[PDB]
């Protein structure tokens, strides 16, 4: 029945000031201090600081005492973060989590995804990575480059091929946008016969993409 | 107060035991607490004050220790249970430090990558850049090397690679390379190729094509 809600994303630009928010329930919210901590990808977790909702008493770790704001709002049972002049180190999942009574961090947030960066919204531009030529098994895909932000979704043939994909971590290039691929790998004696179809979704720029990969000629 | 966890790595098989270790740089009684971190999800609280089990955790996780050397153990590991694990200190002041985190990995028998290459597409040299692509498929363990030749010159510094997460049915890893250029560059070079390295194959392998 505890529970913390967290917003999933925010995006906001270099230099600007961000709050995150962590709304409770299921428990007297009061009596536990909230804890939050940062976690970059493929990072470990560190935590940032708390806040007892009680007593406005707070602490930080040494990198945030000079980063971060925590406040609540007891009557709506939300404590919240404020990041300020943020730059690209601050981009990273910020959970909230709620001490318990012996200590140790016994309820967690879903985590917001806080983006930071310059780039403009921009749908991907689709490429096929065409099948070898010159065939046991063989191998294609699709180059999905230059969006923001994360994430697209890919499947193939619109659904109908999902045994043999892998669709990759997504990479940030040194333009700020993304770049991401997807492969699979078919029996090549259906390369002359079997339609493949990649199908990209960028959600947040309302970009749909449909790129048949062929061999070449 | 610094808390370690000194493997970051470690591989296990299904119905075996695992041992994952944690180090308080201070007498701490028993106030460690183990988190369990899933790919995509946060963390969970699995165990508190070295040993206790929160409600509905399953049997198979355990923890003792006390004072400073503390151990977190699964008795015999399910395939579910591929995660991060992560120690907390949480005895008396603040900074309530984690420790680095330990992932675990499934172990199986050595598998050499298949390899493929992928020439820029005509519709991307149109518009101006060119991206060459290597793909090294299904191999085990993770521990991989791609190195893009273009006319026997090795390249520095415009590549990016990503790793898959492990396979969760045949336990492989796969791993995607993209040489970048511009359209220039890359019209004014004749041969492609990447070089493979891994344990799997006795020599370095490579796939290369001709710009023609």
């Known amino acids: 029945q505890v529970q913390l809600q967290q917003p999933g994303t925010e995006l906001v630009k270099p230099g600007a000031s961000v709050k995150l928010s962590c709304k409770a329930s299921?428990?007297?919210?009061?009596?536990?201090?909230m804890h939050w901590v940062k976690q970059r990808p493929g990072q470990g977790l560190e935590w940032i600081g708390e806040?007892?909702?009680?007593?406005?008493?707070?602490d930080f770790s040494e990198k945030f005492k000079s980063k971060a704001t925590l406040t609540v709002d007891t009557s709506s049972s939300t404590a919240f973060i404020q990041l300020s002049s943020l730059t690209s180190e601050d981009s990273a999942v910020y959970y909230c989590?709620?001490?318990?009574?012996?200590?140790?961090?016994?309820?967690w947030g879903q985590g917001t995804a806080l983006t930071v960066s310059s780039a403009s919204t921009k749908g991907p531009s689709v490429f096929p990575l065409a099948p070898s030529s010159k065939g046991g098994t063989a191998a294609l895909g699709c180059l999905v480059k230059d969006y923001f932000p994360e994430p697209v979704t890919v499947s193939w043939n619109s659904g109908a091929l999902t045994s043999g994909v892998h669709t990759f971590p997504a990479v940030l290039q040194s333009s700020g946008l993304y770049s991401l691929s997807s492969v699979v790998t078919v029996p090549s004696s259906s390369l002359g016969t079997q339609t493949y179809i990649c199908n990209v979704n960028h959600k947040p720029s309302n970009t749909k993409v449909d790129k048949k990969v062929e061999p070449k000629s | 107060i610094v808390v370690t966890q000194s493997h970051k790595f470690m591989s296990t098989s299904v119905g075996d035991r695992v041992s994952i270790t944690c180090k308080a740089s201070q007498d701490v009684s028993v106030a460690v607490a183990w988190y369990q971190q899933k790919t995509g999800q946060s963390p969970k609280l699995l165990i508190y004050s070295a040993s206790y089990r929160i409600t509905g955790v399953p049997d198979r996780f355990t923890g003792s220790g006390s004072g400073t050397d503390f151990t977190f153990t699964i008795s015999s590991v399910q395939a579910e249970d591929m995660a991060v694990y992560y120690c907390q200190q949480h005895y008396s002041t603040p900074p309530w430090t984690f420790g680095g985190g330990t992932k675990l990995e499934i172990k199986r028998t050595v598998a050499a990558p298949s390899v493929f290459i992928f020439p820029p597409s005509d519709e991307q040299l149109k518009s101006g850049t060119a991206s060459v692509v290597c793909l090294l498929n299904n191999f085990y363990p993770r521990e991989a090397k791609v190195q893009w030749k273009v006319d026997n010159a090795l390249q520095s510094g415009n590549s990016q690679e990503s790793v898959t997460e492990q396979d969760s049915k045949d336990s492989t890893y796969s791993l995607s390379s993209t040489l970048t250029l511009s359209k220039a560059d890359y019209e004014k070079h004749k041969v492609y190729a990447c070089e493979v390295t891994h344990q799997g194959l006795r020599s370095p392998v490579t796939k290369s094509f001709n710009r023609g």
């Open positions: 989590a709620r001490w318990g009574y012996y200590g140790s961090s016994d309820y």
């Open positions: 299921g428990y007297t919210f009061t009596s536990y201090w």
């Open positions: 806040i007892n909702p009680r007593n406005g008493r707070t």
